[PDB]
Amino acid sequence: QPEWQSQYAVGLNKLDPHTYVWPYADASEVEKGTFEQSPYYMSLNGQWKFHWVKNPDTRPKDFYKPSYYTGGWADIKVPGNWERQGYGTAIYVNETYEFDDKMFNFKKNPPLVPYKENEVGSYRRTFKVPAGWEGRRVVLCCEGVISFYYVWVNGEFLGYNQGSKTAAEWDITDKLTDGENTIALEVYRWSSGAYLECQDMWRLSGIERDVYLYSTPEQYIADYKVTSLLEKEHYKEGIFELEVAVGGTTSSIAYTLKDASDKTVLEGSRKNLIVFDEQRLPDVRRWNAEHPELYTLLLELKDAGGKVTEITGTKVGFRTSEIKNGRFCINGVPVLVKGVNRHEHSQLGRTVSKELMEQDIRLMKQHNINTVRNSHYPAHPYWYQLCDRYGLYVIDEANIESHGMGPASLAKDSTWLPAHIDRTRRMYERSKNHPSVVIWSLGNEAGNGINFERTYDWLKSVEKNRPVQYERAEENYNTDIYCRMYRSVDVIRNYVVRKDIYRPFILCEYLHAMGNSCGGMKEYWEVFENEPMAQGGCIWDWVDQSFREVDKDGKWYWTYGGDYGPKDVPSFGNFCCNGLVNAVREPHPHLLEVKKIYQNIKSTLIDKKNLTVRVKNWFDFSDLNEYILHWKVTGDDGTVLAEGNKEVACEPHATVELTLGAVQLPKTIREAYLDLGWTRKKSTPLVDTAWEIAYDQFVLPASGKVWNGKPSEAGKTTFEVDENTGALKSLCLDGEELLASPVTISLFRPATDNDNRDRMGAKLWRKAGLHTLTQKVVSLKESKTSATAQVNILNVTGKKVGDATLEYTLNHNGSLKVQTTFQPDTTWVKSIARLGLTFEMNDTYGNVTYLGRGEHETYIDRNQSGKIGIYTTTPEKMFHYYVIPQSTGNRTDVRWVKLADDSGKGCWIESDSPFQFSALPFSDLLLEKALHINDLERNGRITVHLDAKQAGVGTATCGPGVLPPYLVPLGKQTFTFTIYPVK
């Protein structure tokens, strides 16, 4: 019955969507984009009277009349979802509608949403019109509100809106009065629009973005279209065109384009839809992600007497974006799209501050991302100004996702066209003059059909200079870019070798970054970096969508689906957390991998004797003469043998060779590493000149027989093997025990999020009972200084998981060799997570030192990043707080590892080749069992894992699982570890 139950009720009395035309005070203000400090702007953000009900019948219907008294109401902060200020229920669900549930007495039935279970938040505040605004036109702007609202000013109805992610505006000039004014919005949690707002995110309510007033003369700048292109022959001369829509009602409109040095470079004047003259800048400064060169465009209306009545403006970037000869190109250069999807998220909900937005782009740039896709809705206006300013390509996207709904698709019901086209026009209008926006996207998981054909058609008709994509379009005409998402390496290869294609393969979403993830990233990039027509894609995604809480003991933790509300509250668990960073922008390990693979200066060692390196310049518009190579050779002892700085010139996409020189490795050193690091000669305000923007390490075998790390005999070793399990049950040094538990064979790791979906993952492990192993002795032979045990490896059901031979040999050294031979019964063991030994030490042994890949967590299918070296750390520092606790803390390519107390007591452990290890504060049982961070408890011991083999992590939570070279072999295998007690 009411408006928010209709898919047509998308607005009433709003202004036509347009570009932001904030009136500024001063051309100098226009260059800074500093419009909020304008005398013609007034925020309505702040504290507002607020009221909440479940059931629109029980609401205070008359709260919008100035006479209705709201003094006994609470305040609520605006902007900010009300779920994060103590009201109602935050719900996370995924491919479903949270309201399509029994808790709400409703089955989904578009365009209808629940009625009696629907929620109303009534907002009201008062305000004074600034004195200086006398006789001016005043516009009310609400930057975004979810889901549907009525709005009143002074008790006069303005109208209503659906569409939560772009501004709605009303001209409220004739509704204002003297003295105290009031403003009211009545906000519904659900309307028909929610069916198009079924994004993979928190389902939240209320006023999400700024609410404000701005004021213009009776005659104003209503809109304007900026064209700043390059000629398509050499891409060197700028093309400048400008149209200005003047609204209302002798006078002139004039523009001035100025360069970074405030010098005027183009300028026009006319005495309503004014079309200025086409103009040309030769040898113009061009815009792109690496050199975001900008101009400032000032637009002024003038009195019949030549006085300035209004000034507005925007940054201008001369640049082109196109699909050329089937490849996506910026300024005539086909580029690799190294990007990420970004959702808007903070502890306040959908509401993101300027500092958090700046944090976002600062970290992105620091980790070699060059493009961002706006996860299924346009973003806060300020995000685009950041991208123009610091250089990111934006793939902007209409707020349209009806995942919850083939033949019943909302893409094919023409009665939803008005909603679709409204959402699309609004996305286009507000951002059309940003150079940072390179691609328009039509929506997300909303199906294909006539609605997206009209959307595509319309968009193409007004936009000639940006590609338009749509992922659900697949190969149909209505998409300019083949977006297909989460495809496997093979599927990309099936595509690019076809001869009847004309569109680049660019992954809209790929490499699902959920929990301990982003395995197989190297393999994707071997393809992109070699296929002229798979140009990369956008990682899913940037930031975990989580909320930090604190339990009754002061233990903090991350929340996700099911965590707020009653017991059977709709919920898709932790699947909203998929980020390269945690919710407060602290990076996850896998993000360091992304910085490594996304780097723009890649190198190989081409000649070991001269140390000659081939350097490939993956930049699109930067010469390597902007950077400085630092190189150095270092021995396993941590002694720099040769170091230098170097300066190479090399053009984008070109390669270049560089000889470093032979370097004499001593005979006492066992191996050496050649490290290459690159930094910039000039800072940006985001990256200083000490920040390592690309690196590479290469292993140099040397002649030493022993690790300069090997300790010397440190007293008298004893040990004991268990009659029953065959496990090493004791190891002393002059009587002092070193083990807090026996050494046994482990085959299992507490599931990562991926492990839980992986075809070869924890589903198999837990079902074979690998997380519950015991050893039984079949035969045990002992001498004074050695032992050989043949054991059965059983799960808790008693089933034999495999056969093993455990060989303990005390060396004349005092070191103990442990050589293990294991073979799983591959008749019913289809997978193992790892192959190695595990044991506990008392938690005083927290000084961990190792020679291995570091300083951060790496896995065999995620370890291009990091550098082999000597590193100091602790089990507390190694444990990474993934939203659900899972395996963490792995080190790869390990030569040796030490665990010691501060007193110096401990052991130094080596193998016969590079191994993997971890050492964590929490046991495996506990870590597997914990569902939230605060569930973790310490038991006085650390758990050490020594692995000959452990699986990669892959990305199975969505898309490819661990690739085959990274699975753990099931053949008979033998691996050995040698423990050297120390003092």
Of 944, 938, 918, the C-alpha closest to 752 is: 918
Shortest distance, position 366 Cβ to K ion, whole Å: 30
Q: Which does 630 bind (CB under 5 to 8 A by kind): a copy of itself, K ion, none?
A: none
How many residues line the site for a copy of itself (CB under 8 A)? 27
Q: Which does 572 bind (CB under 5 to 8 A by kind): a copy of itself, K ion, none?
A: none
Binding mask 852-881 for a copy of itself (x = CB under 8 A): ----------------------x-xx-x-x
Q: Which does 698 bind (CB under 5 to 8 A by kind): K ion, a copy of itself, none?
A: none
Interface with a copy of itself (CB under 8 A), residue from 52, 106, 150, 188: 52
The answer to whether the peptide bond before residue 147 is cis (omega within 30 degrees of 0) is: yes
Using rule CB under 8 A, residue 86 touches a copy of itself = yes
Q: Which does 52 bind (CB under 5 to 8 A by kind): K ion, a copy of itself, none?
A: a copy of itself
Distance CA 968, CA 655 (A): 37
Query: Any idea which residue has 């609520």 for tokens?
Result: 76
Cα atoms in the Cβ-side hemisphere of radius 13 Å centred on 193: 29
The answer to whether the peptide bond before residue 79 is cis (omega within 30 degrees of 0) is: yes
Using rule CB under 8 A, residue 458 touches a copy of itself = no
Task: State which residue, 433 or 918, has the beta carbon closest to a copy of itself.
Answer: 918
Using rule CB under 8 A, residue 51 touches a copy of itself = yes
Query: Any idea which residue has 């190479």 for tokens?
Result: 648
**DSSP per-residue letters across 929-957:** H-SSGGG----SEEEEEEEEEE---TTTT
Using rule CB under 8 A, residue 240 touches a copy of itself = no
Angle CA 677–680–684, to nearest 5: 135
Q: Which does 735 bind (CB under 5 to 8 A by kind): a copy of itself, K ion, none?
A: none
Q: Which does 86 bind (CB under 5 to 8 A by kind): K ion, a copy of itself, none?
A: a copy of itself
Using rule CB under 8 A, residue 8 touches a copy of itself = no
Task: State which residue, 217 or 885, has the beta carbon closest to K ion.
Answer: 885
Task: From residue 703, give the alpha-carbon distance in Å to each of 667, 708, 761, 912.
Answer: 6, 12, 41, 16
Distance CA 288, CA 293 (A): 7
Kindly name the residue from 169, 186, 397, 445 that is annotated as catalytic.
Answer: 445
Binding mask 489-528 for a copy of itself (x = CB under 8 A): ----------------------------------------
Distance CA 935, CA 922 (A): 11
Distance CA 702, CA 679 (A): 29
Q: Which amino acid is at 160?
A: Y
Shortest distance, position 89 Cβ to a copy of itself, whole Å: 10
Task: State which residue, 163 or 854, has the beta carbon closest to a copy of itself.
Answer: 854
Using rule CB under 8 A, residue 72 touches a copy of itself = yes
Interface with a copy of itself (CB under 8 A), residue from 12, 42, 74, 605: 74
Kindly name the residue from 509, 593, 840, 910 that is annotated as catalytic.
Answer: 509
Binding mask 539-578 for a copy of itself (x = CB under 8 A): ---------xxx--xx-x----------------------
Task: State which residue, 51 or 124, has the beta carbon closest to a copy of itself.
Answer: 51
Distance CA 793, CA 824 (A): 8
Please name every residue paired with 242 in a beta bridge, in sequence order, or none if there are none.
226
Using rule CB under 8 A, residue 477 touches a copy of itself = no
Shortest distance, position 922 Cβ to a copy of itself, whole Å: 12
Distance CA 169, CA 160 (A): 10
Shortest distance, position 567 Cβ to a copy of itself, whole Å: 14
Task: Quote the tokens at residue 326.
Answer: 């089937």
Q: Residue 733 carries which DSSP code?
A: E
Of 139, 196, 195, 187, the C-alpha closest to 167 is: 139
Q: Which amino acid is at 887?
A: S
Residues of this chain, 582-601, that bind a copy of itself according to CB under 8 A = 584, 586
Q: Given the rule CB under 8 A, which of 49-57, 217-225, 274-282, 834-842 is the region that contacts a copy of itself?
A: 49-57
In sequence order, what E strands does 831-905 have? 834-842, 847-854, 867-873, 891-900
Task: State which residue, 549 or 720, has the beta carbon closest to a copy of itself.
Answer: 549
737: annotated active-site residue:
no
Task: State which residue, 248 or 573, has the beta carbon closest to K ion.
Answer: 573
Q: Which does 87 bind (CB under 5 to 8 A by kind): K ion, a copy of itself, none?
A: a copy of itself
Q: Which amino acid is at 758?
A: D
Count the residues in the chain. 983
Shortest distance, position 595 Cβ to a copy of itself, whole Å: 18
> What is the sign, positive or negative, of the torsion defined by CA atoms of 860, 865, 870, 872?
negative
Query: How do strand 437-441 and strand 393-397 relate by DSSP bridges?
Result: parallel
End-to-end CA distance of the chain: 81
Shortest distance, position 934 Cβ to a copy of itself, whole Å: 10
Using rule CB under 8 A, residue 488 touches a copy of itself = no
Report which secondary-structure segment, H or E, holds 431: helix 417-431
Distance CA 58, CA 61 (A): 8
Q: Given the rule CB under 8 A, which of 86-94, 292-300, 833-841, 945-953 is the region that contacts a copy of itself?
A: 86-94
Catalog residues that contact K ion under the rule CB under 5 A: 885, 930
Distance CA 29, CA 40 (A): 12
Distance CA 889, CA 953 (A): 13
Distance CA 329, CA 581 (A): 29
Q: Which does 477 bind (CB under 5 to 8 A by kind): K ion, a copy of itself, none?
A: none
Task: State which residue, 51 or 165, has the beta carbon closest to a copy of itself.
Answer: 51
Task: State which residue, 14 or 932, has the beta carbon closest to K ion.
Answer: 932
Query: Any idea which residue has 């109602």 for tokens?
Result: 88
Q: Which does 584 bind (CB under 5 to 8 A by kind): K ion, a copy of itself, none?
A: a copy of itself
Phi, psi torsion values for 665, nearest 5 degrees: -85, 130
Shortest distance, position 86 Cβ to a copy of itself, whole Å: 4
Task: State which residue, 69 or 477, has the beta carbon closest to a copy of itself.
Answer: 69
Report which secondary-structure segment, H or E, holds 111: none
Show Cβ contacts of residue 787 under 8 Å, excluding neighbours closer than 6 positions.
721, 780, 781, 806, 807, 808
Using rule CB under 8 A, residue 71 touches a copy of itself = yes
- CA dihedral of 343, 619, 384, 191, whole degrees rounded to 10: -30
509: annotated active-site residue:
yes
Q: Which does 69 bind (CB under 5 to 8 A by kind): K ion, a copy of itself, none?
A: a copy of itself
Task: State which residue, 400 or 920, has the beta carbon closest to a copy of itself.
Answer: 920
- CA dihedral of 940, 941, 942, 947, whole degrees rounded to 10: -160
Task: State which residue, 381 or 885, has the beta carbon closest to K ion.
Answer: 885
**DSSP per-residue letters across 850-870:** EEEEESS--BTTB-SSSEEEE
Q: Which does 406 bind (CB under 5 to 8 A by kind): a copy of itself, K ion, none?
A: none
Task: Quote the tokens at residue 703.
Answer: 């002649």
Report which secondary-structure segment, H or E, holds 489: helix 489-496
Q: Given the rule CB under 8 A, which of 50-58, 100-108, 125-133, 654-662 is the region that contacts a copy of itself?
A: 50-58
Shortest distance, position 592 Cβ to a copy of itself, whole Å: 14
Shortest distance, position 574 Cβ to a copy of itself, whole Å: 18
Shortest distance, position 880 Cβ to a copy of itself, whole Å: 8
Distance CA 148, CA 145 (A): 7
Q: Which does 275 bind (CB under 5 to 8 A by kind): a copy of itself, K ion, none?
A: none
Task: State which residue, 317 or 885, has the beta carbon closest to a copy of itself.
Answer: 885
Rule CB under 8 A: which residues touch a copy of itself?
A: 51-54, 69, 71-75, 85-88, 548-550, 553-554, 556, 584, 586, 874, 876-877, 879, 881
Enzyme catalytic residues: 445, 509
